[PDB]
Nucleic acid binder design. Sequence first.
DNA 1: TGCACGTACGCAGTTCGCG
DNA 2: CGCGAACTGCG
Length: 750
Amino acid sequence: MILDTDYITEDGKPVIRIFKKENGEFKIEYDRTFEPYFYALLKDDSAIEEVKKITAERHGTVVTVKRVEKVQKKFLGRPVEVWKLYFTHPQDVPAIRDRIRAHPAVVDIYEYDIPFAKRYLIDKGLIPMEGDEELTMLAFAIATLYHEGEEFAEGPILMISYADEEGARVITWKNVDLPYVDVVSTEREMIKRFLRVVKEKDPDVLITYNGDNFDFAYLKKRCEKLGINFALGRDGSEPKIQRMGDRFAVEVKGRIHFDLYPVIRRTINLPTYTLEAVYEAVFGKPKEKVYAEEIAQAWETGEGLERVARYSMEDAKVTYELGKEFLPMEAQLSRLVGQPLWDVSRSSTGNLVEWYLLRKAYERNELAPNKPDEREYERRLRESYAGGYVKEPEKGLWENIVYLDFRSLYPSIIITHNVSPDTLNREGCKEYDVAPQVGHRFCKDFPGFIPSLLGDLLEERQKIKRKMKATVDPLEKKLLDYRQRRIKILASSYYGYYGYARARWYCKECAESVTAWGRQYIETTIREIEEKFGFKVLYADTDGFFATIPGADAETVKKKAKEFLDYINAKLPGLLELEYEGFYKRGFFVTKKKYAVIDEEDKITTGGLEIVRRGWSEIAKETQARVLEALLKDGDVEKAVRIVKEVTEKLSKYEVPPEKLVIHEQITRDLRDYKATGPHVAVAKRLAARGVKIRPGTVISYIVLKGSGRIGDRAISFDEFDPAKHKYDAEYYIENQVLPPVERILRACG
DNA sequence: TGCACGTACGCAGTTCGCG
DNA sequence: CGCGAACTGCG
Ligand SMILES: Nc1ncnc2c1ncn2[C@@H]1OC[C@H](OP(=O)(O)OP(=O)(O)OP(=O)(O)O)[C@H]1O
Ligand SMILES: [Cl-]
Ligand SMILES: [Mg+2]
């Protein structure tokens, strides 16, 4: 099984290293035969003699073209002649590629920014995480104090906990009387003892929770401060903190640092992504949290450290347990894209698609299009196109509602109509499909590039859903639900990639064709079910709609909808198909993207309401839920009013826990780049001045204090909140949090 | 190491600025 | 003192 690749330099020449686990043994393979290269499109073949003359420099040594070879390839499925330009070292490519492109005889250059080690995985056709090998995993976490004004790594690590299949232990240099705590003398010994533990256990995988920016980065930053040779790599090297543009990431040669945090970010949508919140969401059990205030007190007083040692142990314990569940799903994703788990587990979804596209392109001798420069990137960001069809919903309460939904609409459209950049307005074909409204044409004589890849993803999603019905255990069902959602996000990201300004295979024409087809399919389907079947469509969005036969009983609507399904599915071509997605007794639709229905089991599912949205306090989420209960279940408009007025009286008497009072909101950019400053940004700008690092992705949890003026002026983070000292704004939570969400359900006056 | 900068659109709703 | 911009996050 391939674990990762990198390269080292030997006698000025690159040497690929292939880290593998084969038959339960770690191994490094060496390849000194791979030459860095990129392509050049020349106006005339005779110019190759001038192109060979172009030189450049890096750190004193001159960079030359080592060798050239004229190859025949395809660009968007059309034959093209280009020159393969070879070079001695990978670092030569960034130094000379610009000067090579600007030559007047060079039309363009291609595939000039592929990292050497990942270029190797594609060209030689290796797939990481392939094969039947069991990987050993070891989680760890550190406990570290931080005063107001302390810099990075200036504080000592108090505790280093770790966990695997054999249990969990804590290492510390203060005496704690616990059978899973090993008390050493100093911090250096504790760090050295941890180094010995990992070398002894020799895990293939090191699991952390946001260790890229905290635990692993701190531990290494401390090892440089005390002068500890933290030889963690299996090649005898130290963990290396890697600059990843805005963020940093920790790599350990020969192992795999699995940082669960970025994985969890793009799998589960949570209000906050603390280790405690993630554990409860995944395993359905709560996890107590010990805050830096109690760790500072227990460290200073010397009492209650057993409570802290327990917290530290559980950090590593739940990190192993979470890592145990999410590593195989990330491994399968690594197998598809054909890139190492270390990279795949930290990549954006757009990057995963492109790397897979790059591999597939090489497989078919297709020259890759280049990423856009700064100007073309700005142009694509400025252009857009029409999206999903949305219908203003029918107001009032409706009964016997059926929800009909298209199955993987956008991928189905891409496959069925062969929407791809190599098929768009392609001349010389005998059959075309014409995109409605926009009029783009797509060749159908051969499977298009992206359409030829989407089928397997859809089949992979249905197989997981098949297992979901055969799943008895509720935990395996939840994890399967995660997996099929990740595939659905990935498959639909192929459509979105077409509109991604940074995409190599950018295709605005493809993206607006998919939506146009999606609009025509859902709109004509609505017309058909209404005019031919007497249904009344209550609410419709991009690929699905709610409908009913007004006045007909539950069974009648239920069977006419099934009859309608067979009727249009025989009319729809290719992979397009409507699904019977669910039946609901009653329901109503407040506005676009906001609704709530109740099923035959009296379970109330909602869409787009404040119940699921981040930014609304829990007492606001709770009050809307109970009002929806009194409406959709009991049908008591007056009961919901009594719930609201009673909750508002709880707020005025300060009878509410400040826990139900927290507002969560995320930063989406650099704090210096915010034009306007909202409450979560005003708070975030404060913690930025207090030393707490805030970056795109940080979730602020604040409470609004009693005052008059801007909300951001009286906002305070939940950490520093003291219920005895601080008094929240009772009027704000009544009038701005609790009341508007329930008011907007104004079927009756209020 | 020299890659990543985070798949798309349509839209409800809040804070804030300022007239 | 109503509204437009800035912003977040839903489906
Ligand atoms: N994150 C997304 N990015 C781009 N397009 C998307 C996304 N989510 C949905 N779409 C597209 O928007 C329309 C449609 O929404 P469904 O949420 O219904 O996802 P399927 O339809 O794919 O699959 P199912 O019905 O669950 O089998 C989907 O094609
Ligand atoms: Cl060799
Ligand atoms: Mg669908």
